[PDB]
Amino acid sequence: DVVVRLPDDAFRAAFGVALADAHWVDKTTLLWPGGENKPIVRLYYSHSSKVAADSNGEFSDKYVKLTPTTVNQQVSMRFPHLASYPAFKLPDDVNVDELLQGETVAIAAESDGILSSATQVQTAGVLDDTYAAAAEALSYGAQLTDSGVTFRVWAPTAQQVELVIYSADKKVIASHPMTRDSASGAWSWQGGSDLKGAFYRYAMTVYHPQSRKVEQYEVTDPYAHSLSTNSEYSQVVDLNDSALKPEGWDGLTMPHAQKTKADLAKMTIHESHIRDLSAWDQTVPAELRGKYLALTAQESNMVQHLKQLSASGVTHIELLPVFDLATVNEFSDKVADIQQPFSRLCEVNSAVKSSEFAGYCDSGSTVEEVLTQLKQNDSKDNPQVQALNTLVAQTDSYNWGYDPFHYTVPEGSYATDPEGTARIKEFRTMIQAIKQDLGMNVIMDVVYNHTNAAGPTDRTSVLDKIVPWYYQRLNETTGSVESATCCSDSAPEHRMFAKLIADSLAVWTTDYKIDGFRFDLMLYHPKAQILSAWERIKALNPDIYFFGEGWDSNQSDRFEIASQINLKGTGIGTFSDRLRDAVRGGGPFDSGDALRQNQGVGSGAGVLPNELTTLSDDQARHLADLTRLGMAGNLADFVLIDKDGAVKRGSEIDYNGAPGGYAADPTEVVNYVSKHDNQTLWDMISYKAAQEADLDTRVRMQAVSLATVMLGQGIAFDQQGSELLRSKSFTRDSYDSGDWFNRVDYSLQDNNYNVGMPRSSDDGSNYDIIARVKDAVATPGETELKQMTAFYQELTALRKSSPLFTLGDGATVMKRVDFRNTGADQQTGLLVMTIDDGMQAGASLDSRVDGIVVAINAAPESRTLQDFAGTSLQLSAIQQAAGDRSLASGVQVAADGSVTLPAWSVAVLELPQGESQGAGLPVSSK
Template structure:
């Protein structure tokens, strides 16, 4: 609060003279030992105000509750800053009379203090008529924690001192409060993600949708706060304060632990820049606790420490094995150290190549631990604190980041070993865990009943930093965990806890226990597994067509699949189901790879069927799992009925609106207790996800995963791609679902160089694959998926957060098993590693020449229009090449011809493989290279070869292609044209030279009801109908946290487009046929899959280019005649011409290409009026010129003589 102006009431003005002459008597004695020494005079600036407020009931009486108020004040060894010389202060029979009385805040005393006194605190006890209104509590003024106006506050019945008063009645019953103090002046809009999980179950509302809920209020001292309904105070709630709506800040996963709350009630305080909740009211981050000084001392190797202060001339490292270090801010000394070592020797500059982001702000010091008689390996097993100084004194006190020292000390030996539960030939098992900073590790065996057995001590290897238990009696199928004793900087304590194995290959239900498993055990292999081969060779990567699917989406609601197999791995083995038949047709047409969204162990799906509820189950079951639903005015009535969730959703859909968004509100109750999540929340990297198995407890998941792979390869006819997410973990710190960071704290996670916080630019707790033992874990994990599960390719989530060197090393590791394995991923450039700040990243431009693919946002944005972060009116105004920019404007579009032609240039370049060296004539008439075409200030072309590009217009992220098109299409356009627009847009990817990447259901006009981000939106929004009766359009407004600001434009689109945007079964079937046609065309000739950049540059040309081009039309020829003829590419053809007409105007006898001897491709000619080349009339060659109908795709072929 601001410094208040106090106006005394008439009663107080009368009472003050009386108080000044009264004598107070009491029989109580302080439990403290007072020091009666008085202090000399002080200046007026050295005053602190101490307030005492009586209860409202007392204050409403006839007499003042402060008429017999006094304050007992004293100094002792612990608190000696009081500078007053009034002997009444430490006379228990008297005490100090109030300096004044404020009508609102109560009696107050102005106390002089010594500003430079080392203890920085004052002891005091408020008294009323000799009694202690705060209880038996010796209060202290912490002079480092004063509120506005140098004030502190107390209130009757609460044993606490506040920098700003939080009245007892300010917090309603059954409510907790969390404050976020942003002392750095950050005025961002903060939200709080709140949820129940694990042991924390006290939150009495639905789990918040990320990024969370808005603040309930604001305190000028403590910052924004959230009042949270709770159902008790027996455990805790999970929280993440963040500003993800408009920034990139978030804490780690924190627990508001009610067992730690004290006299002030269920209230917690977080300081921005820390990952700790305090339970006493604080105005500032405490400066006497080590972890709050950040962690800007960073090991560069085993002898070099980098210090985040360029003025430092000396650095001292302090060590405590039992975590007893405390930094005294007044004396600027470290207390309780077991050992210290000081260096004044500057380091060399060798470290700068490994830590380039630190060169401008950090200074290196060389430490000779051997000369000091110290063992760095031992030091790293305890608490470390570094103090940096110059000639004037201490400059910095900070914690220490150990990762590079651990690499230097241990990695050379450690990378040569195997880890996890290693089954020996005799059936015994050896366990090995890399935990070099642990003080002790034990193996805890568990029986099938999950009851612990006698612990087994593990031995430490000082060379590798690993702990092992050799030839134990545990065997295939037994469960276990590790018990680790380790210093953890997140709590500044020596922690002892049990943790699962990061090298787990099998798990118990919900990943509570690791399981010993022999992956070569015969029981885990379907018949024929050992000889299973991929149906498609991967030597010609340009031939790939990647089809992105999600295990649950694929089959959760398909009644042609056995009920027990829906949403499971096993659904892929049901050969007669309509969904498997659909995949078989795609495979016959030419789709080569099935890409599966995460199928490793996922932290955010409950694997216990008794703890989840899904659409086909009774609504009442949701009410049991979510009791708050029983109090919902719109939904509670269904709790006592017999309806299924699906039938209730269907009922609510009819009256869903932005004024009453019932569908998304019901989905908000459901989404954290259903079985759906995309799965980008890794828990254990090398175990199949249990919720996708018919039995999640144990090894069933392994065999059913293998059966799925076998069915996809052997029966469906596709290779298998696995989505991997090594760039982050679901949790870090000491949280229940933190694995890596609990075993080797501050090693596996990437830390901020100043605060030591785990970076979270990915979404969650970023990992550090630049550290050797995490790179080793990734190598070993990928090796397992390739060798033991026969995965053919890997899609890397946020690959740009990985070092390129690590990705290439992992690829080399995988190729030792399968020489033709393929990597591709998201080469986005952002976050703390952006622009190669910390290392050369695996980003789009850096991947050129590596053979590793990356998703191209260039073609995506050009075809769709706008960008993935558009909102509200811009979603409609920003049309794209595939939905009518300039040629078929909507009511909000004001795009110019130049903008439309620029998007056409981006589309052309994308169809040429997005090569940086590809040359063509741009919209201005200039001949340019792909690297010279602009894409939002970047070079559009960045690849060397086309297999380094994944071209797509829709994937799991962002709106589906159908949904984004409806935002942008002219309301009057009929449904038939909208279907054709979908096909034309997909053709840019399928018929281009890059590797096509297709979102499951794009061929079925898939809708998610305009949902922008459906990662946790459940089956209702994510469903796919392979029966082709519905595309899931308009099943309710999308979730508010993602699309609430778009509801108005969504309702307008739905209302204005009407039936034009509502596909029927025939429309879906037509689109499916169009897609299969496009795929068949691609497969028909290797001229469409040249792959090699030099071949594309030599053979591919565009003909409707320059400033006078026809908007909306792309004409691409691929030459195979004369000296360029190559029978290995296509012996039957001398050339192909691909024409995409994304306009309402037919292309008639196109003048800029000589089509002599060209004819419509045989596939399209045979299809006749069922072809996408037909729209009222067929595409044709007339007078040696090409003619193509509006909104059509035609491929023309020239047969080789």
């Protein structure tokens, strides 16, 4: 065979290895554009060295000859996005296992044997085709039983793997070379039960394509179930151990059913964060602030508040990242929080010590006291509060935590003791407290769409160190780890990562009794993978609920994505951005004046315009169409009368170019008007409300906005604190904005509004509009916060009171739900929904009523309805009981049966059921 050599340092390097656009997708298939129409196409490989030309300019390294071929159906189906790549066939006798042990490079040469191009090889595909099936049949991690322990880690390309055992003081007590299984590429080691509690890491000797060298490093277990402080070492644990469970743990049951669609529809979520809950509560014992155990402080304002929310209708607590995140140092001596001395901050943060704030280092003030004094002179021209806070954020205990370090171990900073197994029982104690004492189910936010880091050097790179270039999704040409998620994109489409995900979810389900999972950026996951995971988990908990959000994934070229459209009819829920945008107004991408111009139904679009908006009545009514559709579950087939009086199915109501209604059942849709990301509802209302809308009116706008969600058929979701008019001082993306901007005051003194300009890096372009609208009205106080809490609990209580609000089944929604005040002659801003329980709907689902009317008057005028004359409609007892503190205060139900609602009001009316099921409110034929 002609020896490949360089032509006869600059343009010369051009004839070396570059990029990584070669893809070894299966046993004998290599996809690479560089070998097209090339006489010589070879796959060179070196066990311990980097493939390169020798002193003679030749490639003496060993290789395998590749011949032209056409990609088969199998490969085309697995990797559609590479189906256009020139294909090359490898001999059936190639020792795949051996070549995968080192570096492989695709090289193409001309007839004379002169190099034309050489590139690195992406092997994820061949790894799955070769080892996946065998590897999938095995279980991983430090599997400790009473009988002994079996460690197993998947590392099909590693040349060596040793199990390093460490003492409690982190001294090596043993290094065991592991046993490799050729079929699976997995390494195992079996020992005695005396290894219980032992710390360990895997010493890897493996080639990493990024660095092009055989790396040597110790890595924690990707299947770790316990960890040392700050995740430096994994730990052997048996989660079944009674010593790791609170008393009565095994008997813990779900306080809320999730079996039928009707059950699921009652789901009413309170999205919370561990620090957001207790970091500021002085009634929570100091040692428990910012900890899982804060949920057990029954005497605290925070817990008492959650207890009442539960009693009033909130059914689920959704937790922001409580798996092991990487962005918070778990070593307490390296952290400084605002409640501590500024001197402590300077000692742990050199950036602060070298900043303009250095003068506060030897002051006797706490960081919080300094931030407080900086408020008065803070403004768009002197954003000093955020200036100091930005530095504080680098070394505090705060972060949302969407930075996965270990997927199946609880976060350590939220435990009172981050060293070892301690956090496991504490986490369980919290779960038990929420379900048993607070009466709410628990949902965990999971982030399998990306890892905190990748590469052979980053402290937090775990998966990409053990099996390089396999767990991350890479660019087809460069081989760089993609960052479309923000960070280090993962590859859920790869078999062993899909398995890791499912195995992880199984532990949270079985061992931590989590009731549901919310997938972050779910559309970055294949539809098939999410469904397979659900199938596996349902075998463990038949009533587990899966849902997620995204809507921005551009991975459709690689596989069918888990999107709103593709998940229709599957039973997997998705956050709907339809009602969200219609009621809040505008979109998450708005900045500058658009934030104020884009009013929503909740902030008076059309009916109470501010000085900058240009919204037309037509545009306002379109938002109302999206809102009504959402209140009916955002179903693709739901039939309504649109703004122009036309008969339209949900799929026909446009949402920025896409079909508005997309679901098969209302349980596949999660409605909301506020969430951890993007501005809070209150801050949006502050951006959009007309100058003349007073404080009281804005509180009602918050309630009216939330009413579209709470009284709607879709699953109800809301941000912790909406009931307290929560503000982040206009911060749009508060993930690292600390305790200061994320503060929730359970003592009810204020809503954290106007506490300094938000971070300039992300909100600086909004400083102008913020300065102009910020001081329109007074900042909410105890009176307004108590007012809002009452409104909120009134709404959740109403939702909880009747099964008619949560039908669950799409067909049932279509047979019972309808709307009035529709068409061209509608009274703008007035949403009127009817729910039938009469003879024509079928059986009576509520023995107390024959029908319900939901009227949301999102307008500054009193509105009169004649649609129910002669029905004997009555205002719900729940609202009547609230008197002048009700959202229905002032509502009039005359003799003639007409109903009149005051401005910014919400009324739930009922048709009392008598001896037998009555006529009800039959849906009108359209």
